[model samples]
Target: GWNDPDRMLLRDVKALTLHYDRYTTSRRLDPIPQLKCVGGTAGCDSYTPKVIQCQNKGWDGYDVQWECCTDLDIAYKFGKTVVSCEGYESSEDQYVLRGSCGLEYNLDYTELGLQKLKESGKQHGFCSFSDYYYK
Candidate 1:
């Protein structure tokens, strides 16, 4: 049964062309920025991994804070991983890592204060800390 074959062919062609155009247009647009928090030590020894402290003015206009710590107690309290710094002397002279700021969001990164602890793992790069900052 061949009924209105020409009309069906024209309709199919229009639909396909419309879809292709819309898909191409969407791909050209820039994606929205996402808030990401990464923590680790790339230039430090295994006994002392870098830490990061992140803070943001909350959507409600209050200060919200989070940090990476080497102490297990502080880490658990702040929902961060505990880095280790074993066999280290001069607790007052430990080095801490800082995070880069001013990219997209309102988060401000402060230097990680001196804390005695060892590295969590052999991190050749940054590790995912948490995604709560976006919220």
Candidate 2:
């Protein structure tokens, strides 16, 4: 026996079933992006990797896009996630930026690379890893 407030809360949270029903009937829409990725590995790995072209568009106005490839299968499975990279000066090293991702490969930046980025005035780069997820 579902309560009225429970139903209301579900609606407020944009429950998948309700939202899909509404969109299909009234809006003449199809399945959502999340549903499109259903099935086996092929479906889950159908997402394209997006390159972060500009620093301003990245998290905290820092560029986090690396040349390394991302694992689309794991990314789609997790759906939505974020990874943060912090850049700071170190005693032994001049600068260091470290980040870990559940979907993509771990990232490490040392002073030499950081210095190059600093030269371009883009050293402080942060990443919204979820943006690279399957959509």
Task: Locate the minimum summed-lDDT window of 10 residues in model 1.
Answer: 11-20
lDDT of 1 by residue, 1-135 (tens): 134121111111111111101211112123221222223332112222223333322424332222222232221112233221111122221221111111111121222312424333332323223332110
User: Residue by residue across 1-135, what tens digits does model 2's lDDT show?
Assistant: 233121111111111111111211111122222212223322333433333211213333343332222332222222233322211222222122221111222232233433332223233434323333211
Please count the clashing residue pairs in each candidate, in the order shown: 4, 1
Off by over 4 Å in 2: 1-44, 53-78, 86-135
Candidate 1 Cα errors over 4 Å, as ranges = 1-45, 50-53, 57-60, 67-135
Please tell me which predicted candidate would have the highest lDDT against the true structure: 2
